Paper text:
The assembly (folding and membrane insertion) of OMPs is mediated by the heterooligomeric β-barrel assembly machine (BAM). In recent years, our understanding of the mechanism by which BAM mediates OMP assembly has advanced considerably. It is now clear that although BAM is composed of a variable number of subunits, [name] is the major functional component and is sufficient to catalyze OMP assembly under very specific conditions. Unlike the β-barrels of most OMPs, which are extremely stable because their first and last β-strands are held together by a large number of hydrogen bonds that form along the entire length of both β-strands, the first and last β-strands of [name] are held together by only four hydrogen bonds that form at the β-strand termini. Biochemical analysis and cryo-EM structures of BAM-OMP assembly intermediate supercomplexes have revealed that during assembly the [name] β-barrel shifts from a lateral closed state to a lateral open state and thereby enables a conserved C-terminal motif in the substrate (the “β-signal”) to bind tightly to its first β-strand ([name] β1)25–29 in an antiparallel configuration.
For two of the structures, we crystallized the [name] β-barrel bound to darobactin and then soaked in either CP1 or [name], and for the third structure we co-crystallized the [name] β-barrel with CP3. Our x-ray crystallographic analysis shows that, in contrast, CP1 (B, pink), [name] (C, yellow), and CP3 (D, teal) bind to the lumen of the [name] β-barrel. Unlike CP1 and CP3, [name] binds primarily to strands β3 to β7 and does not form interactions with residues at the lateral gate or the [name] C-terminus. Three [name] sidechains, R5, R11, and S12, interact electrostatically or form hydrogen-bonds with [name] residues E470, D512, and N492, respectively. Like the interaction of CP3 residue R4 with [name] E470, the interaction of [name] residue R5 with the same amino acid helps to explain why the E470K mutation suppresses the toxicity of both peptides and supports the idea that their antibacterial activity is a consequence of their interaction with [name]. Instead of locking the β-barrel in a closed conformation like CP1 and CP3, [name] might inhibit [name] activity by constraining its flexibility and thereby preventing β1-β8 from folding outward into the lateral-open state. Indeed, both darobactin and at least two of the peptides (CP1 and [name]) can bind to [name] simultaneously. The darobactins bind to the [name] β-barrel seam by forming an extensive network of backbone hydrogen bonds with [name] β1 that enables them to function as competitive inhibitors of β-signal binding, offering an explanation for their broad-spectrum activity. We found that over the entire course of three 50 ns simulations RMSD values for both peptides were consistently below 2.5 Å when compared to the crystal structures, demonstrating that they were bound stably to the lumen of the [name] β-barrel.
Author numbering:
A (entry chain A): 423 to 676, 699 to 726, 730 to 807
B (entry chain D): 1 to 7
C (entry chain C): 2 to 16
Write the structure that this text describes.
Amino acid sequence: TGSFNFGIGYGTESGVSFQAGVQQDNWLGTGYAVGINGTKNDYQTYAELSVTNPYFTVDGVSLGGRLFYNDFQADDADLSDYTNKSYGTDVTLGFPINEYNSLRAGLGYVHNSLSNMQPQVAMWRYLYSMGEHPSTSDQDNSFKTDDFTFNYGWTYNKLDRGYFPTDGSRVNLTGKVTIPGSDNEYYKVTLDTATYVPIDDDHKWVVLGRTRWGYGDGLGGKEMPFYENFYAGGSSTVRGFQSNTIGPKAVYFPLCKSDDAVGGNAMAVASLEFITPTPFISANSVRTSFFWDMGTVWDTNWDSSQYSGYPDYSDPSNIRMSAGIALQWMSPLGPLVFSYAQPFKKYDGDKAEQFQFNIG
Amino acid sequence: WNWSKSF
Amino acid sequence: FSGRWXWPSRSVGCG
Ligand SMILES: CCCC[P+](CCCC)(CCCC)CCCC
Ligand SMILES: CCCC[P+](CCCC)(CCCC)CCCC
C-alpha cells in the first residue's frame, strides 16, 4: 500500500545531504497520496506534508495540497549572512495538455521570518522600500512578511530517454506574482531549457545547449525581496565557480566592499556542452563531456550614481565564463557527476572552484 | 544513495 | 525537492 525512504548524498555545494519520507498512496481510501518528506543539507532544511490526487478528474487533472517549512542559513550557502525561516501552504492544479506538455496553476501562502541580517546596501535598500528602517550597526534585527501568491508553470519534455538523453528538449517555465493583501508586491519568472542534438546515427556524439533565465521585480515602489534572489555559480549553472558566487557582492555598513555574494533579481546562464564517447573501456553507464559555461547575475535596482566608488551591480554585461570536462556515471552510491573547470572569465570578488562533484 | 522499502 | 512538479519552489536551489 505505502512506502518509506531515507537517502544520503554528498556534493561540493550542499555538503552531506539527507532526505527522508513516508508515502501512503490512496491514504484511507481517499484517492489521495499522503506524503511526509524532509531534506537537510549544510545550509537548508526543508519539510512538507503533502496530499495529492493525480486523478482529481478522470482525464488526469491533478490536485495537490501541502503544508511546508523551510530554514535557510545564507552564510552556509556562501552569501552575506541572514536566516530565513519560512512556512506556509500551497494548493496546485496540474493539467496535461498533450504527451509532451503540462501546465500548472496554484495559490500559495508563505510567512517569512528574516533575522541575523548583517547590514548591507542592497538588503537595506529593499527593507527601506518596505517601510522598514533597522539599525545599520548591528545584526540584531527581525523582519517578518506574509505573502499570498498566484503560481503557474509549464513543463515541456520531449527527450528520447530520461537518463543520459541524446535527443529532444526539456523546457521548464515558472512564474509567480503576489496577490493584493501580501506584504511583498512582486513577480518572478524562471525559464530553463536543455536541448540535445545528436550528431552521429548512434547518438554517441551529442550537443547539449542549456539556458537559464530569471527575472523578478517589485510592482509599485517595493522591490522583490532579497530572499527570492537568483544566484549563479556551481555544478548546475556555471562550473568552475563556487556556488552562488556570480553577481553582486555585499556592500556592508561601517561603505565597505566585500566578496560575499548576495544574488540578484536578474540572471542569465548559457552553456554549450559536447557529449562524446567515454575514452578507455566500453558504455551506456558513463557520459563524458566538454563544456563552455557562462552566466551573469545582476541587481536592476543598484543605484550606481549614489555608489560610484563601487562596481556597478546593475550591469548585466559582466558575463562569467568557464571551460571544462565532466563525467557522469550511475554509481552504486547513486548518480555521480564530476567536473573540472577553469574560470577563464571572472570578475572582482568571484571565488573559483575548479573541481566540483555530486553524489545522489 | 537512496533506500526505499514498501509496507 | 520543494520545487518538483507540480509545486512552486520554496527552497533555495530548487527554482
Ligand atoms: C484527506 C484526503 C484529501 C481531502 P481534500 C485535499 C485538498 C488538497 C488541496 C479534497 C478536496 C476536494 C474538494 C480537502 C481536505 C480538507 C481538510
Ligand atoms: C532560449 C533557448 C535557446 C536554445 P539554443 C538555440 C540554438 C539555435 C537554434 C542555445 C543554447 C545555448 C548555447 C539550443 C542549442 C542546442 C544545442
